[PDB]
């Protein structure tokens, strides 16, 4: 709340 998003 919020993000950390597009994998590895």
């Amino acid at each position, epitope marked *: 709340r919020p*993000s*950390y*998003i*597009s*994998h*590895l």
Partner: antibody
Amino acid sequence: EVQLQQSGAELVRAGSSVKMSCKASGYTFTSYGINWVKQRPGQGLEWIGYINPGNGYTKYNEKFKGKTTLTVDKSSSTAYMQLRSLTSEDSAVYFCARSVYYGGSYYFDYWGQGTTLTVSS
Amino acid sequence: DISMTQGTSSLSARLGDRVTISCRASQDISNYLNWYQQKPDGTVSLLIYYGSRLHSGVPSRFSGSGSGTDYSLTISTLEQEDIATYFCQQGNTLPRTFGGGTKLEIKR
């Protein structure tokens, strides 16, 4: 456009081994991890393990380590899963799935149709 | 490991009902919970991820909530295509684990 096409059904005798594939497309193969899930008609789903195409790093579920080996081919965007010393306990459908990073950890956003393995003579 | 349990194995409901599928972790998973929908045939897709609240591109009628050890998926206004099997999955510790699943079926 994110697609994961897995191998075709498999037929193998006990004591033998098998290697299935999961071809990815529509995204950057090395930017996401691949997980493998096991589904026997009874139980639910079991997490086998995970691999990072980028570095080849692999983490296994203790129960499945020893008989399972996850590999990957960066030149064809394909992840492979080899099962050894097969028994009827290995008869199930196997899925590969992509992982994505939100907050602290991961989740599987895309899955393949699955690969059916039947161990018998 | 962290055991995930879904009290109901099969659940009955009529189209248009507000459906609730539960799931409980054996320990606190800090909202690291995901929901997947498996079909009789086209088989598997993600609906909600993280603490059961984030969407993915699925209809708004799918909502998720929970915290600590108890979480749930609510399908407001159930539709025909929604008839399927639902699995929860904790992403807090390793190995990753799923609940036994919950298969919805039509009341008659």
